[PDB]
Amino acid sequence: RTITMHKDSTGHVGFIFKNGKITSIVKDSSAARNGLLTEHNICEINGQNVIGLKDSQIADILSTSGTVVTITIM
Amino acid sequence: RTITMHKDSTGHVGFIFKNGKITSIVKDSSAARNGLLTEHNICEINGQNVIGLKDSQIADILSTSGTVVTITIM
């Protein structure tokens, strides 16, 4: 349930989340091409367990990540 | 060059912008269905001229708008 994505020229892989759960996918994005889908909880980012982290704490992980971002969902 | 959109259940019409210019479209969104496209400058929102407003000032207009949001682009 692990997806590898790559940031675009604006620094985004292409998803929106809330309460730990993916809610929207950006058109023409890495998230779109790699088949990330709404309504699933985020379990890991770059192999780190993020279950139970606050959205701002997940956002910090995402924003500070380098170009490649791997995400595991439940 | 005027598009009428409708906020979804998360309160979004489905676009990202920077420096007054649309940069991304959300999949399955009102912006997508109504044919908003990247790389154009935002001229008006709900009939108000926003040329020259800061991104935060455009964001306030968008966020405080009711359900229907009309946008004109150059």
Binding site: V13, V26 | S24
Partner: peptide, 4 residues
């Protein structure tokens, strides 16, 4: 909302 924020995009990532």
């Amino acid at each position: 909302d924020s995009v990532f």
